[PDB]
Amino acid sequence: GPKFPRVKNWELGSITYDTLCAQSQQDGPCTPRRCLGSLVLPRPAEQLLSQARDFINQYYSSIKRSGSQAHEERLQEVEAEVASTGTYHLRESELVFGAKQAWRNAPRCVGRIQWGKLQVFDARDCSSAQEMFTYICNHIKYATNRGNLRSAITVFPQRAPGRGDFRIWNSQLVRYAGYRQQDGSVRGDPANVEITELCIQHGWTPGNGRFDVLPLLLQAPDEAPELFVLPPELVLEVPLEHPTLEWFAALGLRWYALPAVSNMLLEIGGLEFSAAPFSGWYMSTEIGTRNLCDPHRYNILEDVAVCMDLDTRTTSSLWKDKAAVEINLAVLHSFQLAKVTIVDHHAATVSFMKHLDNEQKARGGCPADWAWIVPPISGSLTPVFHQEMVNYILSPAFRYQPDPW
Amino acid sequence: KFPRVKNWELGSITYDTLCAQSQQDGPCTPRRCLGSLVLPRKPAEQLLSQARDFINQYYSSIKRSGSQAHEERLQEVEAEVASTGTYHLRESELVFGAKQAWRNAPRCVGRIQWGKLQVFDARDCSSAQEMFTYICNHIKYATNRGNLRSAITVFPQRAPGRGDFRIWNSQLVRYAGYRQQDGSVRGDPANVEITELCIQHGWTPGNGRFDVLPLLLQAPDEAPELFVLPPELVLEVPLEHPTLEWFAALGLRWYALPAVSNMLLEIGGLEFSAAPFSGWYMSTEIGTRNLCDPHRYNILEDVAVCMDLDTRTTSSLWKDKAAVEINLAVLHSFQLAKVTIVDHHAATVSFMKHLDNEQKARGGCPADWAWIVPPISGSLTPVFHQEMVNYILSPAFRYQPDPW
Numbered sequence: 001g002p003k004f005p006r007v008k009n010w011e012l013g014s015i016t017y018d019t020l021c022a023q024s025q026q027d028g029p030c031t032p033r034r035c036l037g038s039l040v041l042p043r044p045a046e047q048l049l050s051q052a053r054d055f056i057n058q059y060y061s062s063i064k065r066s067g068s069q070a071h072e073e074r075l076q077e078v079e080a081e082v083a084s085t086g087t088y089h090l091r092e093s094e095l096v097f098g099a100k101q102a103w104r105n106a107p108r109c110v111g112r113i114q115w116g117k118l119q120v121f122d123a124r125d126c127s128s129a130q131e132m133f134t135y136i137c138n139h140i141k142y143a144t145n146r147g148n149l150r151s152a153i154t155v156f157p158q159r160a161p162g163r164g165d166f167r168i169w170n171s172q173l174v175r176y177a178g179y180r181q182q183d184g185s186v187r188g189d190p191a192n193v194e195i196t197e198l199c200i201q202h203g204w205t206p207g208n209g210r211f212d213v214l215p216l217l218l219q220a221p222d223e224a225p226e227l228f229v230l231p232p233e234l235v236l237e238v239p240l241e242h243p244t245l246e247w248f249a250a251l252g253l254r255w256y257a258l259p260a261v262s263n264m265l266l267e268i269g270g271l272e273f274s275a276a277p278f279s280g281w282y283m284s285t286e287i288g289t290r291n292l293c294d295p296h297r298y299n300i301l302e303d304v305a306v307c308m309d310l311d312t313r314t315t316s317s318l319w320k321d322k323a324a325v326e327i328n329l330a331v332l333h334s335f336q337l338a339k340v341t342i343v344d345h346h347a348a349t350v351s352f353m354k355h356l357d358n359e360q361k362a363r364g365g366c367p368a369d370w371a372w373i374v375p376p377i378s379g380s381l382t383p384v385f386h387q388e389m390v391n392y393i394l395s396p397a398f399r400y401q402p403d404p405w
Numbered sequence: 406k407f408p409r410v411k412n413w414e415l416g417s418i419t420y421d422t423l424c425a426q427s428q429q430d431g432p433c434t435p436r437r438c439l440g441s442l443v444l445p446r447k448p449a450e451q452l453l454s455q456a457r458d459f460i461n462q463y464y465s466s467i468k469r470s471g472s473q474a475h476e477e478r479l480q481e482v483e484a485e486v487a488s489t490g491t492y493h494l495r496e497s498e499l500v501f502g503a504k505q506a507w508r509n510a511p512r513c514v515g516r517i518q519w520g521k522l523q524v525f526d527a528r529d530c531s532s533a534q535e536m537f538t539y540i541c542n543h544i545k546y547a548t549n550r551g552n553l554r555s556a557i558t559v560f561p562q563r564a565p566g567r568g569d570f571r572i573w574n575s576q577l578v579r580y581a582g583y584r585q586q587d588g589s590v591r592g593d594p595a596n597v598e599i600t601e602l603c604i605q606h607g608w609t610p611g612n613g614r615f616d617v618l619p620l621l622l623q624a625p626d627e628a629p630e631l632f633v634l635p636p637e638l639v640l641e642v643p644l645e646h647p648t649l650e651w652f653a654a655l656g657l658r659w660y661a662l663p664a665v666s667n668m669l670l671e672i673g674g675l676e677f678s679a680a681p682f683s684g685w686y687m688s689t690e691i692g693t694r695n696l697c698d699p700h701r702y703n704i705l706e707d708v709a710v711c712m713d714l715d716t717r718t719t720s721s722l723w724k725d726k727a728a729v730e731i732n733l734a735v736l737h738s739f740q741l742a743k744v745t746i747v748d749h750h751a752a753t754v755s756f757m758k759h760l761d762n763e764q765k766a767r768g769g770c771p772a773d774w775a776w777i778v779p780p781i782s783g784s785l786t787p788v789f790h791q792e793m794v795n796y797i798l799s800p801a802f803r804y805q806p807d808p809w
C-alpha cells in the first residue's frame with residue numbers, strides 16, 4: 001500500500017493510512033529498537049522563525065488564503081518583528097485558531113469531537129497576580145454556567161526574553177486538599193499533598209476535611225506567587241448518591257463540576273504561553289474510576305465493596321470490578337440529577353470514533369495515545385479498544401512543563 | 406540511552422538495560438509511535454551469528470560459559486552451517502530456547518510461569534498423521550483432567566528446499582462459525598474462514614454455536630489433511646452463574662485449553678513453523694473478549710436483558726454490569742468444574758512480581774502495555790499504573806502469514 005502507517009480497526013475490519021504524521025516536526029520517545037509509548041513523561045532565533053512561519057502557514061490554510069498577499073505580508077511582518085525584537089506577537093484570530101488547534105492536536109484527549117467549539121479568552125493584557133485572579137474567576141464563571149458547562153481557555157501573556165513567567169502553581173483550578181497525617185496517611189486527595197503544603201507555607205490557613213477546595217497560587221513575572229481563595233459560590237460541586245444503593249449518599253462523597261487544567265504550556269508558532277488554563281467537562285470514569293478508586297488516590301473501593309457486602313478477601317469474587325461499576329454509576333447519576341454536564345465512557349468513545357473519521361477526511365489522520373484514550377474500566381467494551389492509533393506530536397500543542405518551584 | 410520506567414502507584418523507578426540486547430527493530434520511529442498496531446507493517450553469516458549468540462545464551466544459562474563443551478558446540482554449529490547452510494539444535498537447547506521465547510514474549514501476562522514448560526520434541530515427525538498423534542498427546546498431557554500444565558510441541562524446522570510443516574488452525578481448539586445467507590454468523594465469527602476451509606477439505610459440518618473444529622494439518626508440499634479430535638480429548642466447561650440461575654439457560658460453554666498453533670518459534674536463527682503451545686486461561690479472555698466482543702459471540706445485550714437492565718442508554722452502564730457478571734460466571738464455572746483458570750487481578754499481580762524478578766535477573770522485561778493491561782477494570786489492576794518498555798528479544802514467537 002501507501003508509505004504511511006496503516007491503521008486498522010479490528011472490530012470493523014476497516015483500514016486507513018495516516019498521512020498527517022508527515023507534518024510532525026518534533027520527535028517523541030520511541031525508536032526502532034524500543035517502544036516507550038506507555039511512559040507518562042517523555043524526557044531561539046532562526047529556530048523561532050521557522051516555527052512561526054509554519055504556524056502562519058497553518059493559519060492561512062485554515063482560512064484558505066495560502067499564497068495570498070495577506071499571507072506573504074503577514075510572514076514578512078513576523079520576520080521583521082523577530083528581526084528587531086527577537087520575538088513576535090499573534091493577532092487575536094491567530095491565537096483563537098492556535099488554541100483550538102492545540103486542543104485538536106492533543107493525543108491524549110478523547111473529547112476532541114468538540115475541538116471547534118472553544119471559547120478563547122484573551123488575557124494577554126494581564127499585568128498582575130490580582131488581575132490573573134479576576135480573569136480566572138471570570139473563566140470559571142463562564143465555563144461553569146450553572147452546570148451547563150462550556151469549554152474554554154484563558155491565555156495570559158507569553159514568555160518574554162529576560163522577564164519572569166506568568167504561572168499558575170496549581171495543576172488544576174479546582175483541586176482538593178491533601179493533608180499529611182501523623183500516622184503517615186493522608187486526609188483528602190493524596191495527589192495534592194505538595195501543593196497543599198505550599199499553600200500553607202504561603203499563608204493559607206488549612207481546613208481538615210476530605211474535600212477542601214484549595215486556593216490558588218498565582219505568580220506574576222518576577223514576583224513570589226500570591227494566594228487567592230476562590231469564593232465558594234463559584235465552585236460547583238456535586239454530592240454523590242447512587243440510584244438504588246440508598247446508603248451510598250451516607251458516604252459523603254462529592255466531586256467538583258469543572259475539570260480545568262492550569263499547569264500546561266500552550267505553544268503556538270514557537271511562542272510559549274506558560275499560563276493558559278483550559279477547561280471542559282468530565283468523562284465519568286475520571287472521577288469514578290481514577291480519582292475515587294486509584295489506590296494512591298481516594299482509594300474507596302474496599303469501603304464500597306464492604307457496604308455492598310462483597311467478598312473482599314479473594315480476587316475471584318470480582319469485588320473490585322463490581323464496586324467500581326457502582327461508583328461510576330453513582331457519578332453519572334448524581335451529575336445528571338444535579339444537571340451538571342458529564343459524559344459516560346461509552347458515549348465519549350463513540351464520539352471519539354466519529355472524530356477519527358472526521359479528521360481522516362479533513363487532515364488524513366489523528367494523533368492519539370491509545371493507552372490514554374481507552375478508558376480505565378471496561379476498555380474492550382468501548383470501540384476505541386479495537387482501533388489502532390498512531391501517536392505523534394503536532395504543533396500548536398499543550399506540553400507538560402516543570403513545576404515552578 | 407536507557408529508559409527510566411516508573412510505577413505511578415508506588416513512585417518506584419527502574420532503568421531498562423535489557424533492551425540493549427534487542428537485535429530486531431519494532432514498528433516505532435521518533436516521528437510516530439505504532440505500538441497499538443497488532444501486526445508489524447513489515448545468508449550464512451547472519452544465521453551463524455544468531456546461532457553463536459543463541460549457543461552463548463545456552464552455555465551461560467547452565468553456568469558453563471567458556472567450557473570445552475561450549476567451544477566444541479560453537480565449532481559443530483560453524484562446521485554445519487559452513488557445509489550445509491543450516492544446523493540443528495540439541496534437545497536440551499531446544500528446551501532452553503522454547504522457555505526463553507515464552508519469557509521474552511511481550512504480550513504475555515503469564516510469564517511468571519516461564520520456567521515450567523513441558524517441551525515435546527516432535528522433530529522426528531514426517532507426516533500429517535504423525536503430527537496428529539503428537540497433537541493428541543500434547544492435549545492429553547496439557548489438559549490433565551483439568552489440572553492444566555503448560556506445554557509446547559515442536560515440529561520440524563523450516564528448510565531451504567521445501568515447504569513448511571504447518572497447522573492451519575490458529576488454535577488447537579476453536580469453535581466453528583457458519584455464515585448464513587443473510588450475513589449473520591452461527592458460532593464464532595472469528596473462525597468463519599477456517600470453518601469454510603475445513604468444509605472444502607471434506608469436513609461434514611455441524612450446525613451449533615459451539616461445534617469443535619477439526620485440525621487441518623500440513624506436511625511439506627502436500628495439501629493439508631483433516632483430523633477430528635476425539636470429543637473426549639477436548640475438555641469443555643458449561644457456563645453457569647453463582648446466583649443468577651437463568652444464566653445456565655443461555656447454553657454457553659468454553660473449552661479448557663488455550664493452545665496457539667499458528668505462530669512461528671525462532672531459536673538461534675532456526676525457524677519452527679509448527680510449534681503449538683498452551684497454558685491456561687485468564688478469565689477475561691473468555692468472559693470479556695470471546696463472549697462480549699461485538700465481532701465475537703457478542704452476548705452482552707442478551708445478558709443485560711436477562712438481568713433486566715435499561716438497554717437504551719449508555720449511562721446505565723448496562724454493558725459494564727453485564728460484562729462483570731459474565732466474567733464472574735466463567736470464573737465460577739471453571740472453579741466448579743476444577744479446571745485451572747486465573748482471574749485478571751491475580752494474573753496481573755503475578756506479572757508485577759515477574760517484572761521485579763526479571764529486573765534482578767536480567768535488567769528488564771519487554772512488555773506490551775496494551776496487551777498486558779486487561780480489557781475490563783484496567784486501572785483496577787497494578788499493571789495499569791506500570792510503565793513498560795517494549796522490544797523484541799530472541800528466541801521469540803512471531804506471527805507468520807496464513808499458509809493458504
Ligand code: HEM
Nearest residue numbers: 103106108109110111114151152278279280281282283398
Ligand atoms: C469537552 C469535554 C472534554 C472531555 C470530555 C475531555 C476528556 C479528556 C479526558 C478524559 C482526558 C484524559 C484525562 C486524564 O486521564 O487525566 C483528557 C486529556 C486532555 N484533554 Fe481533554 N476533554 C475535554 C475538553 C478539553 C479541552 C477544552 C482541552 C483544551 C482546550 C482539552 C485538552 C486536553 C489535554 C491537553 C489533555 C491531556 C492532559 C494531560 O496530559 O495531563 N480537552 N481530555
Ligand code: HEM
Nearest residue numbers: 507510512513514515518555556682683684685686687802
Ligand atoms: C500458564 C498460563 C498462561 C497464561 C495465563 C497466559 C496469559 C496470556 C494472555 C492473557 C495473553 C494475551 C492473549 C490475548 O489477548 O489473545 C497471552 C499472550 C501470549 N502468551 Fe501467554 N499465558 C500463559 C502461558 C503461555 C505459554 C505456555 C506460552 C508459550 C509457551 C505463552 C506465550 C504467549 C504468547 C506468544 C502470547 C502472544 C500471543 C499472540 O500474539 O496472539 N503464554 N498470554
Ligand SMILES: Cc1cc(N)nc(CCc2cncc([C@H](CN)Cc3cc(C)cc(N)n3)c2)c1
Nearest residue numbers: 040041259260261278279280281282283286400
Ligand atoms: C480539560 C479537561 C477535561 C477533562 N474531562 N479531563 C481533564 C483531565 C485533566 C487531568 C486531571 N487529573 C490528572 C491529569 C493528568 C494525569 N491523569 C495530569 C498529568 C500528570 C503528569 C505527570 C503528566 C501529564 N501529562 N498529565 C489530567 C481535562
Ligand SMILES: Cc1cc(N)nc(CCc2cncc([C@H](CN)Cc3cc(C)cc(N)n3)c2)c1
Nearest residue numbers: 443444663664665682683684685686687690804
Ligand atoms: C498460551 C496462551 C495462554 C492463554 N491464556 N491465552 C492465550 C491466548 C491466545 C490467543 C487466542 N485468541 C486470539 C489471540 C490473538 C488475538 N487476541 C491472536 C492474534 C491475532 C493477530 C492478528 C496477531 C497476533 N499477534 N495474535 C491469542 C495463549
Ligand SMILES: C[C@H](O)[C@H](O)[C@H]1CNc2nc(N)[nH]c(=O)c2N1
Nearest residue numbers: 038039040371372789790791792
Ligand atoms: C503507565 C501508564 O502510562 C499510565 O498509568 C497511564 C495509562 N493510561 C492513562 N490514561 C489516562 N487517560 N490517564 C492517565 O493518567 C493514564 N495513565
Ligand SMILES: C[C@H](O)[C@H](O)[C@H]1CNc2nc(N)[nH]c(=O)c2N1
Nearest residue numbers: 385386387388441442443775776
Ligand atoms: C488495537 C489494539 O492494539 C487491539 O485491540 C489489541 C488491544 N489490546 C489487546 N490485549 C490483548 N491481551 N489481546 C488483544 O487482542 C488485544 N487487542
Ligand SMILES: [Zn+2]
Nearest residue numbers: 030035433438
Ligand atoms: Zn512506540
